[PDB]
Write a protein that binds this DNA or RNA. Structure first.
Lengths: 59, 662, 28, 60, 128, 101, 94
RNA sequence: UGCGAAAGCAGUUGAAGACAAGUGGCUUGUCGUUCGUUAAUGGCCU
């Protein structure tokens, strides 16, 4: 994963999520590591609200 | 001179709280928006507005009620192939069914038990539940035709008053009561247990006060009942087994109204703590586990929410909500937390309550059953008429020279001579029993003596006698929404009038020969009409915010380039222009106004080039100047060649949900 | 007069809506 | 005239006076009974809004 | 009158020290307030009175300190916003010139107590 | 001492301004009418000083509008005038027995 | 106020006895502590009356710019004879 | 930021690059970019 901002691994250690910064903004990708059970990714603008884009950077 | 502007805030015309929202057609997501969809808004002073959500919510008709009249619930009924029917309860023992043409009650069915607290309509809309104060649930047979209502069956009684009703289908009827319980009766005719209450459920009571179940809906995709009560808790109950699945402790005070979408992936809910909560079941795991989650929560209203409803179609998916603060709020259904919202103005004066006369610099204004008159100087209230022989008011007009006022409601009208006695007036009734017997919508004063009267039963008299008026082709939308072919507007000065009905028909009339010469020539609902004596023109503006003008004895070249050279303010306008007049110093410039702006278009110039009902659904068929710094706007007019009259509005306890302190 | 000057200097140290009817104008 | 104007107003407006053992009620008019729905029962309207403005929810 | 002469002189372009002298000539409290109420902008009256009260924080004339306290009472919504490049060090050196009186008000009140004690026991022992 | 300790807890803890934000004429008169009594005592007068200073910092327009707290500010002015005469004459007694060491 | 008239006279008259006493501060500690706590906060209420008096004469001079206007500004009225000519049932009556 | 005492005394506030919006440029604003300078109604357990 060629640019990582933030990362976390599940409690069983069976999958891990992280952030990307791949362009307009960052992105979020989850991947199972002990199997190719699941690996998905999406830009986090689809997570974020429509209110947050006209608000402060903390939002 | 430059334009000197009288920014008046004298008129305290205040509407009342929205108590019931309803949509005429049900949802049907995968089909187009029908051309007959109307939202109905019953207020708390007893008037029922009917709005059309096409192109940013214009208001078609208003059905006013009088002194000490309110309206608590209202339901639509449209059997497929027959006219729309609108029933409504007040705070009384009757149901009132209204005919949409006249704007009167065509039936006052006294329900045979107690004071009605709630009303609901059967699925397939042949029966009507009224839930009464003495614990009764009364069924009213509706399917006999529009107007005729029969008593059917009093369901099995109880002690406490039933405050909300819902139907499962044609079969069962659910009712939340004021003892904290939720009963389930069977209204299935020709069963052994018809009318007896099958189940009773009890919500988690408040510790230090009584609990009332305020809102009950049935959710048909699952098999649940959603219920909001006065603790703020919202509970979901399995219908078979009649028992709770899950309870959420959502609001901080009562939950007055809650609703759902078509496929029951969302339940929206609101009450006196003024937040709207959204409970979602959209995940495949949520649908296969029957587990709602408390998804989101929005704070949009100012005081309360007393009514909430939802519409969802192929080009329309919005929930509509209103409360103690008098404004309406539109949100998106499937995009509630994410998307945007629109708080309507508290009044958009499609029917005016204020007009001025240039002589004596005076202005009349009528709220409910009283008129008031003041003059400019400052300003001085010269006279008022709190006529209490009246019960309800409607439109009004003054004679040019300011001699005789005529007030007029759909039951009668009355004419008053006025004499300025100095710092006061003297007002005397002048008797005319033809006026005392006629129904009046509009009176518009041909001369100092001659007026033209539009009756609520589509008659156009000329008093102080009969205009021939041709008939309109009755299509499916005209038989469905039964006021589309009714005369909305008429404007007149100097023996030449023009009337306007909302099918897209605007017909001139010479007051001499009293012949039509129709110029229908239109596509949708007509917002306003004004006659220009210069150019010999009529000026119509429709709900799409386009300005057409036509000649008299079709549209001019100024219209032909103006309509598609129209400014970006008009192209991004949200509030429809409810009033047009012409300038007083120049006979050719015209000066118009909506509820949040004031514009003026120039008669000759042309400028160069380079949350709605938005589908392919049809209409109801099958130097330039712009300002908005007087935006809480009620009425504007002119007095003389340099001054302007801008009368507006200006402002109650509420549930304190405090902003963060620092 | 010294306590007066000192008191005044120390004061310098520690020292360091809509009506119902208007009438206005707009563009012709 | 200031202390009895509401008295003479109500005593000329109201009907159904007594006559010994009897009471002579006026019947109303089809005019009002067909132009308007009847008035709200102020008992139940006051009950509902007094509930929604009870003291236990601190309005302000 | 002479207040109008001082107003015209201080408003034209120049003569600010002589303008404060002409203000000190008639020197009314009501006209002192009126000369602040009339003008719409100042030609760094705060700067010249800042340097005057900095060079004399101990003067027996109450004229320029009275003018400064009424200027700060009536116009301090705008003195903090007219200019903030030289005015910053102006208020800095004015504030540091004036803080010493707050430092030495207790010793002056102490000496006032000393002297009242001495003069009252000297009035007391007056030899019958 | 209980009014003093809740004033001091709001002063140390958060914000005088937060505690004073949504006020107007009718809801400030308790504070200033207590500040009249608290300005006399030594133990309260620092807290009374900064609370009165903050409330006139952020309610200087209500000073103009309402006349029925103008008079409360004037009474507070004469109170601080009496107290400043007292705090000056105490320094004079302090000097006049510093002379006698 | 009233009692420190006594304490200034005790120092003036007995100015020899309590300068010949060996521990003045230790013998009348309570006077020293009382006057220290009375005069310690003098800069604070100096700043208080500066800030208070500034706003006080600020609104005083702004209201003295228009102090004569509120003496005849109230021209309010009530339900005048328009109500009598308004009562249409009482206009059919009298 | 430095020296200081708790007062105060001296110093300020550049550049690059990328992106976003508005009208390939131009303007404005940002930066989980670099170099240099001593410098979202969202509150506390039984």
């Amino acid at each position: 994963w060629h640019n990582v901002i933030l990362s976390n691994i599940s409690s069983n250690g069976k999958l891990l999520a992280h952030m990307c910064k791949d362009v307009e903004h960052k992105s979020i990708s989850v991947v199972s590591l002990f199997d190719d059970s699941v690996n998905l990714s999406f830009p986090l603008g689809s997570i974020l609200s429509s209110q947050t884009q006209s608000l402060s950077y903390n939002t | 001179e430059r334009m000197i502007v009288h920014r008046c805030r004298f008129v305290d015309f205040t509407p009342a709280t929205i108590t019931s929202l309803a949509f005429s057609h049900k949802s049907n997501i995968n089909k187009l928006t029908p051309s007959d969809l109307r939202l109905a808004i019953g207020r708390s002073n007893g008037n029922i507005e009917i709005w059309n959500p096409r192109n940013n919510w214009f208001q078609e008709m208003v059905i006013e009620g009088g002194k000490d009249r309110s309206i608590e619930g209202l339901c639509w009924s449209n059997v497929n192939g027959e006219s729309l029917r609108l029933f409504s309860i007040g705070g009384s023992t009757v149901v009132t069914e209204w005919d949409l043409a006249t704007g009167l009650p065509l039936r006052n069915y006294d329900c045979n038990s107690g004071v009605i607290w709630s009303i609901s309509i059967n699925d397939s809309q042949d029966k009507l539940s009224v839930g009464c104060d003495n614990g009764t649930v009364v069924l009213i047979d509706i399917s006999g035709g529009p107007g005729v209502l029969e008593h059917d069956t009093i369901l099995m009684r109880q002690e406490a008053r039933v405050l909300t009703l819902a139907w499962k289908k044609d079969d069962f009827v659910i009712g939340g009561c004021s003892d904290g319980r939720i009963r389930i009766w069977s209204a299935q005719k020709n069963d052994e247990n018809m009318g007896r209450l099958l189940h009773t459920m009890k919500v988690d009571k408040a510790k230090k006060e009584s609990t009332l179940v305020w809102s009950v809906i049935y959710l048909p995709r699952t098999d649940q009942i959603a219920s909001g009560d006065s603790t703020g808790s919202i509970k979901f109950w399995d219908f078979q087994f009649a028992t709770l699945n899950q309870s959420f402790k959502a609001h901080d005070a009562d939950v007055l109204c809650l609703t759902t979408d078509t496929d029951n992936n969302y339940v929206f809910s609101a009450g006196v703590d003024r937040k709207i909560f959204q409970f979602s079941q959209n995940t495949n795991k949520s649908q296969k586990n029957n587990r709602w989650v408390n998804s989101s929560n929005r704070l949009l209203h100012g005081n309360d929410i007393r009514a909430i409803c939802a519409y969802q179609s192929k080009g329309a998916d919005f929930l509509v909500s209103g409360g103690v603060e008098k404004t309406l709020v539109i949100n998106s259904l499937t995009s509630f937390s994410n998307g945007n919202y629109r708080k309507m103005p508290t009044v958009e004066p499609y029917s005016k309550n204020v007009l001025v006369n240039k002589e004596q610099r005076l202005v009349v204004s009528w709220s409910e059953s009283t008129v008031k008159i003041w003059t400019m100087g400052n300003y001085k209230l010269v006279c008022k008429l709190t006529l209490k022989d009246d019960q309800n008011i409607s439109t009004c007009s003054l004679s040019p020279d300011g001699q005789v006022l005529v007030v007029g409601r759909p039951s009668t009208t009355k004419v008053f001579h006025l004499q300025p006695v100095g710092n006061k007036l003297k007002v005397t009734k002048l008797d005319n029993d033809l006026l005392l017997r006629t129904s009046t919508k509009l009176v518009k004063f041909i001369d100092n003596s001659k007026i033209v009267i539009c009756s609520c039963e589509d008659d156009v008299f000329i008093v102080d006698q009969e205009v021939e008026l041709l008939e309109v082709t009755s299509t499916k939308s005209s038989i469905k929404v039964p006021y589309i072919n009714r005369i909305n507007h008429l404007e007149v000065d100097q023996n030449i009038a023009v009337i306007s009905r909302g099918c897209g028909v605007v017909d001139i009339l010479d007051l001499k020969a009293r012949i039509s010469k129709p110029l229908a020539r239109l596509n949708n609902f007509i917002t306003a009409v004004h006659i220009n004596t210069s150019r010999k023109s009529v000026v119509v503006i429709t709900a799409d915010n386009k300005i057409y003008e036509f000649n008299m004895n079709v549209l001019t070249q100024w219209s032909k380039n103006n309509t598609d050279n129209l400014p970006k303010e008009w192209k991004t306008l949200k509030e429809n222009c409810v009033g047009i007049f012409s300038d007083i110093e120049n006979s050719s410039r015209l000066w118009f106004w909506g509820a949040t702006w004031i514009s003026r278009i120039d008669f000759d110039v042309d400028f160069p080039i380079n949350l709605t009902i938005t589908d392919e659904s049809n209409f109801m068929n099958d130097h330039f100047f712009f300002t908005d710094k007087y935006k809480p706007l009620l009425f504007v007019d002119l007095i003389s060649s340099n001054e302007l009259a801008i009368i507006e509005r200006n402002p109650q306890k509420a549930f304190i949900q405090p902003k963060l302190v620092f | 007069k010294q306590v007066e000057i000192a008191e005044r200097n120390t004061e310098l140290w520690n020292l360091i809506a809509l009506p119902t009817y208007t009438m206005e104008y707009l563009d012709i | 005239i200031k202390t009895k104007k509401r008295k003479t107003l109500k005593n000329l407006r109201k009907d159904s006076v007594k006559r010994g053992k009897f009471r002579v009620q006026l019947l109303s008019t089809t005019q009002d009974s067909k132009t308007l729905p009847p008035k709200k029962e102020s008992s139940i309207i006051r009950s509902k809004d007094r509930w929604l403005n009870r003291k236990a929810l601190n309005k302000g | 009158n002479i207040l109008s002469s001082h107003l015209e002189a201080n408003s034209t372009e120049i003569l600010d020290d002589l303008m404060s002298g002409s203000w000190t000539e008639p020197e009314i409290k009501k006209f002192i307030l009126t000369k602040i109420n009339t003008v719409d902008h100042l030609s760094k009256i705060f700067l010249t009175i800042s340097k005057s009260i900095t060079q004399n924080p101990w003067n027996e004339e109450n004229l320029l300190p009275l003018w400064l306290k009424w200027l700060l009472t009536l116009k301090s919504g705008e003195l903090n916003s007219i200019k903030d490049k030289h005015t910053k060090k102006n208020c800095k050196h004015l504030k540091s010139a004036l803080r010493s009186s707050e430092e030495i008000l207790p010793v002056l009140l102490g000496i006032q107590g000393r002297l009242e004690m001495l003069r009252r026991q000297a009035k007391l022992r007056e030899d019958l | 001492e209980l009014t003093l300790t809740v004033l001091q807890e709001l002063r140390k803890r958060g914000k005088v301004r937060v505690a004073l934000y949504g006020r107007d004429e009718s809801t400030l008169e308790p504070l200033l009418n207590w500040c009249l009594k608290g300005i006399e005592d030594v133990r309260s007068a620092s807290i009374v000083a900064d609370w009165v200073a903050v409330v006139l910092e952020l309610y200087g327009n209500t000073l103009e509008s309402s006349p029925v707290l103008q008079e409360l500010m004037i009474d507070l002015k004469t109170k601080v005038r009496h107290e400043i005469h007292k705090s000056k004459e105490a320094q004079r007694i302090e000097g006049m027995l510093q002379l006698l060491t | 106020g009233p009692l420190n008239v006594w304490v200034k006279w005790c120092l003036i008259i007995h100015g020899g006895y309590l300068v010949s006493i060996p521990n003045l501060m230790s013998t009348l500690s309570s006077l020293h502590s009382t006057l220290k706590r009375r005069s310690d906060l003098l800069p604070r209420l100096l700043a208080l009356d500066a800030r208070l008096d500034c706003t006080i004469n600020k609104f005083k001079t702004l209201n003295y710019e228009a102090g004569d206007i509120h003496s005849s500004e109230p021209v309010v009225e009530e339900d005048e004879d328009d109500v009598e000519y308004n009562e249409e049932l009482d206009d059919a009556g009298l």
